[PDB]
Design a protein around this ligand. Sequence first.
Ligand SMILES: Nc1ncnc2c1ncn2[C@@H]1O[C@H](COP(=O)(O)OP(=O)(O)O)[C@@H](O)[C@H]1O
Ligand SMILES: [Mg+2]
Lengths: 270, 278, 370, 188
Amino acid sequence: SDQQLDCALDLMRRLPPQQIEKNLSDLIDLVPSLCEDLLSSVDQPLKIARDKVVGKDYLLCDYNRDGDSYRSPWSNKYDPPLEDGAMPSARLRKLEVEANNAFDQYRDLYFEGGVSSVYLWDLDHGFAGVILIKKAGDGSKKIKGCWDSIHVVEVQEKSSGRTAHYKLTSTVMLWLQTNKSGSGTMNLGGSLTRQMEKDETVSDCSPHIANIGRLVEDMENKIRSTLNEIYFGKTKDIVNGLRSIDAIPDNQKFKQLQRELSQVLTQRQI
Amino acid sequence: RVSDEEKVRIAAKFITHAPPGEFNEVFNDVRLLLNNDNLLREGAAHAFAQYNMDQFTPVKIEGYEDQVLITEHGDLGNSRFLDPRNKISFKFDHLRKEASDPQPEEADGGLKSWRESCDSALRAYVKDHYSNGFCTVYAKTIDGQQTIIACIESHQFQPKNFWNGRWRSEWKFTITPPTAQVVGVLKIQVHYYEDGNVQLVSHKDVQDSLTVSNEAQTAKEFIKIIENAENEYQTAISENYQTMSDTTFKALRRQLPVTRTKIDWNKILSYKIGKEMQ
Amino acid sequence: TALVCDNGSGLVKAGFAGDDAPRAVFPSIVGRPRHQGVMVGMGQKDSYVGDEAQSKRGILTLKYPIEHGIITNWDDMEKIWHHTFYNELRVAPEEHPTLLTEAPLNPKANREKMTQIMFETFNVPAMYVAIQAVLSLYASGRTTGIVLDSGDGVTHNVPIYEGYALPHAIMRLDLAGRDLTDYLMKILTERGYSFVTTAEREIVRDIKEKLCYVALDFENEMATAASSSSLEKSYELPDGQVITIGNERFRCPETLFQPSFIGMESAGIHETTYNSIMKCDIDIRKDLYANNVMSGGTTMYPGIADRMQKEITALAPSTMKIKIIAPPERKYSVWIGGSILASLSTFQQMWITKQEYDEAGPSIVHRKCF
Amino acid sequence: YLMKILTERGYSFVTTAEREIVRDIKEKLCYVALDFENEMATAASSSSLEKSYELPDGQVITIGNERFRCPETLFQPSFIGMESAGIHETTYNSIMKCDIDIRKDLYANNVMSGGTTMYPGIADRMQKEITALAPSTMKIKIIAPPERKYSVWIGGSILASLSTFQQMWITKQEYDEAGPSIVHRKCF
Ligand SMILES: Nc1ncnc2c1ncn2[C@@H]1O[C@H](COP(=O)(O)OP(=O)(O)O)[C@@H](O)[C@H]1O
Ligand SMILES: [Mg+2]
């Protein structure tokens, strides 16, 4: 039961992070019983659909899905066309169009291309939102790879409206491939998940959109720095620890008096 | 549902895509998801052998030292393999990775003077550069001509520090005077999963040529081209890691925008106005 | 008697090995005349080095020979070393072995030309080159810990385990006190003050050393600075004018934690320290978290220890004990560690003598020296 | 500076009304030399670069080499005692403080605006100086429109005639609510 679900999670966790959709497609025909369970618990690359009314692309997730149709953020319509679907309020839609404009500018500044989507809905006291960002590489400029990012924000108001509580959780999936003469091929991929909580003042000088965008921007910069420094750096260190230039029986020739220096310095300090 | 042959094929696909070091966890996952032991032990039995022949698995035999490499080039049939240095044949257990029944074997004397000269220098090279390195040298005739195959492997499985790694390298040349073509395939696979997950897979194909002479000189030339290929491959990997954040990672997400500052969220229209004037 | 010389990007700290304090601390600048000389009953030189430049900077153009840690001008570095050996120490370099300092993760030709100049022009019996953060850890009475060395040109995060620096975890940030001086010059234009000349750059450096500090919470400090004038401070200029700064006191050092203020891609010193710790093995991370050591003059802001403690406590796991050591003498800590290292008994056989340089050439420093 | 160096030939201008006369002389007679030392040599060698100007009282003055020494201060600010670099070096430092992948488009799209960019030798001199400072494989194009004396106003009319600028104004109610500090919030 749950042990099979945990085994499937631990199985597809240690699979290569470039063929996630293909590996998930031929994993679900093994046991087609927890198909509804793991699809709400694993991380997948996003899907792109096109709004024919406005001529813009928009991303597909489980927070704009009504059975099988998906609500577009630009035109506020479903595709395939249904009736009496799940809709935000007028204040929430007025918030959502500003959020989509602001995060479109965010995606233009930081990603220089790609698809961004923001979806909002109401809660018991505040409002929650999901920000999806997808960028694939440019094939004309010889770039192979993809970036996917999901951010979930929960906002709780405090009646008067002077300050509010924000809670952010983020998941970033990434892969890259370079083909060079000296290195051959180079594939690098993986995923990170982080959380954050913060109370912030809300006024005319700083509305909700600025606070949410600031938190998402700081989280994305932190995750990019962590991916470049900690994880790829550890992979580089493992590569240098497997095979080594500056031969192992020959690099100990310049580590002879260093032991004596260290031991007399520990004598001096004690 | 789907037929059991399709399940066997996709289980073999899952097994052959396993990272280095993580075999028993993948085996536990497939044996707990399939819930059918009889179709897994014998329905997909070449998958384990194929994984061990691809990952260059070192096996410590009883008695002699210098654990041998399980390749597809030294396959004897009925789960038997050979040791070119020990002149022996053994039976390998893929499930428990255990060596048994070490029966002696005799090889032909043609590929002997051209094998030990390469083997001694290759063991010297692997001891000289690789820390936990193992190496094997095969010599056999395929296209009407004897050829030499070299296999180098190094693994550093550290599950408590949440990472595993593997270097594999294969080299091949057909002995034919006065010159021959060397072909090498170099593979690296690294997994690191401390708080998230990151994997690296890489390979390189290197083609060069060498002159043919007596055994010691051509062994030294083989070691020299192996050194001058793998050193440049590792240095190029390091230099590629140096310039990741400015060339390839910038093509997906920049660290800062082109304004070199954070976004002023009270001035979104001031960013949007500047692109409307052609 | 050995000689310990710390040639920083903004100051030179030189003295004899065995003393507890440096004997010559002077700015590393070369000044040249800018105007027309009309009086002939005067000394009338062409280059002024050190304090003589600072006493004559109103008619001088000042040049720093070191920019961002690396040496750009070698004639001016020769002038700095000549003034150090013959005018500030009154020593003869033919009789004394000289210890030298070098920032980590530096080009090798800098060490090559350093050894070539010190052996061919200022001929010493022996010389050695050491890493600055390792000496700063040695001066603090410990052999395991992480050193945050922030000076005038570079900021470095170096972890050292059992007296050996870990080169795969050394982090370099190209932001230090010179960038803070230039950013303060940029942000003093909002209140109407114009500082352009190289002489006025020293005035703004003095303002930064005198009045700036590190806010514990930046947004709350900016909120309190915009509510009342309880944070405004006054400074008297050399010509008698009085200036007043209210919120530039804590915005200028915030570039250490938010490097995008001057347009730099890298992360702050807290994230840099956390990345340098997190690249190490798990069994030494507790010792590296417990032994954070500050170094250099740019760590002399009177709010930096508590802020660094708060940020590293936020980044680290909650069961980890964070202790940050900020010694009161950390403006002179590379020199004290060099004095400790040069006065050791077994260090005397680690000197690169002149005969080995003759038999090897300008490449021995990559084999006998770190 | 032209007012100062006009005293070498004996022409003394002191009052604030005469500063307008010296400005008119500068607008009519000054130019930027391609090479300064060769221009000084040919000015000293021959009386072929001299020009004459008529004062409001009918007196005639003549300037030979003050024509190109006055806008040489834009390229050599040490003539008036300033330590700063020239406008070409300021341009090269502004380009070198940008991202490395956008410097080609910045080097190809150098735009000169304002009234002090109206000397009839300044584009070729700036091209020569920037091409000296830039690397040898880069393309340098300097654009000086003929109407560049009024270029801030034309772009201001373009910006004020746009549909998406009508939300960027600072209204009166916003000034009443926020006081005279919203201009640091709504304007760059
Ligand atoms: N009290 C202070 N507060 C802030 N910064 C200081 C203070 N004292 C010195 N500094 C800065 O320290 C820098 C140089 O310190 P130090 O590391 O001793 O020299 P160097 O960087 O040349 O090694 C100077 O740029 C100066 O701005
Ligand atoms: Mg220093």
